[PDB]
């Protein structure tokens, strides 16, 4: 009851984060990096995932906020090979590139050195660590191509 010293003892909504409904991306300050995209490309999916999983728990262990962990579409490259003493290039290998992303944010500037060292140290054989800064270009690259918008865009050109 409001007039009582115990008023508000049942308050709880201030302890929760405000989740009241697209979303603006928050860039980092001058002493912390913004959203960072830890890409993990590889020819063996199991190795791409096993290391993406490893770095999620690693980030989780270091109290580094992991905004999102997602997979990028698979790229299928057909290795063609010139036949011996001939001309017709005959396919032999069909390789596939599996990329996995672990999106973090709030990495301290001074601590980024220690973190970057640990992750590169543990990199498996066959996997490429590409750590870049998150940008709208990367986010848009995960969405299907829209041919209609391109056709209408040509009219404006």
């Amino acid at each position: 009851y409001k007039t009582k010293p115990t008023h508000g003892i049942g308050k709880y909504k201030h302890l929760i984060k405000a989740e009241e409904p697209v979303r603006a991306i928050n860039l980092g300050t001058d002493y912390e990096y913004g959203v960072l995209n830890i890409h993990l490309t590889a020819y063996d999916m199991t190795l791409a995932e096993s290391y993406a999983q490893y770095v999620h728990n690693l980030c989780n262990s270091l109290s580094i906020k992991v905004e999102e962990s997602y997979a990028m579409p698979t790229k299928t490259i057909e290795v063609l090979q010139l036949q011996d003493q001939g001309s017709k290039m005959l396919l032999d290998s069909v390789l596939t590139t599996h990329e996995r992303v672990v999106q973090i944010s709030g990495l301290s500037a001074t601590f980024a050195e220690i973190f970057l060292e640990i992750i590169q140290s543990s990199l498996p054989e066959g996997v490429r660590l590409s750590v870049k800064e998150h940008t709208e270009e990367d986010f848009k690259g995960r969405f299907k191509a829209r041919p209609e918008l391109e056709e209408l865009l040509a009219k404006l050109k």
């Binding site: 409001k2 010293p5 115990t6 201030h14």
Partner: peptide
């Protein structure tokens, strides 16, 4: 009209400035 609490109120020692940083009861138990 308000009466001040007679002692520490529940949940007062929780720093809500760094809400997103604080650990959570991810579990029921």
């Amino acid at each position: 009209r308000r009466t001040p609490p007679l002692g520490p109120m529940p949940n007062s020692d929780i720093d809500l400035s760094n809400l997103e940083r604080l650990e959570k009861y991810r579990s029921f138990d």
